[PDB]
Amino acid sequence: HVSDLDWLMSGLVQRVPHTTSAVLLSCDGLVKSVHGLDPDSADHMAALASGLYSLGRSAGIRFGDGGDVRQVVVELDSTLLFVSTAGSGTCLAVLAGREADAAVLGYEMAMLVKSVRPYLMT
Amino acid sequence: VSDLDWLMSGLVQRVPHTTSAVLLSCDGLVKSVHGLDPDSADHMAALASGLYSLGRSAGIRFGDGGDVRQVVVELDSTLLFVSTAGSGTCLAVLAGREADAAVLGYEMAMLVKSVRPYLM
């Protein structure tokens, strides 16, 4: 039931200026909901985010008490890509410029994950 | 070689809570390391070049010219920073979550420039 949360993706994008896109994806890399990207950009974003999350989790296993990933952040020249878990089987990927308030983005991404939860429990 | 190893230690020593520093080819080979046994370092070079490679893809699609600058993995109690060093190289640093992000950020940018002469 996570396939129709485009409104939750935009609720996030609309609530933190300088964010451009939010994609909610299965950890195998498939788009479930999205705001801000066209169909092709989203498939691509979801492939990247899931690879980042899986390498992130593997580093935790191979180096640090198998600790869960809190977040992966890619810093590009002109923007940032944030990837965190969004519940079992699921990931949230957000593109935001450096002028984005990262405290506010943190609160918003955390809130989004808790709201997604009832749709994973169907 | 041992010369670069020396610089990797220098970095760990200057930055509290860091535990290791690996310099890697983007194609995933260890060039020098401090604080990981040789097997773990090879794993670090593989995982870090994997992070770099995905971050680079992202740059090409969503960036506007410049390369990925850094990938940070934040785990329960530690952080993995992977910085672009140019010339087919990355710096991968592991640290406990207690490390000072201001200093570590500065020290890593400096190290990337510092090694440059030993890579030519």
TrEMBL record, chain B:
Membrane-crossing ranges are none
Residue stretches making up the Roadblock/LAMTOR2 domain:
5-95
Query: What is the protein name stated in its UniProt record?
Result: Roadblock/LAMTOR2 domain-containing protein
Source organism per entry reads Streptomyces avermitilis (strain ATCC 31267 / DSM 46492 / JCM 5070 / NBRC 14893 / NCIMB 12804 / NRRL 8165 / MA-4680)
Q: Coding gene?
A: cvnB3
- Placed within the complete protein, the shown segment runs 10 to 129 of 144
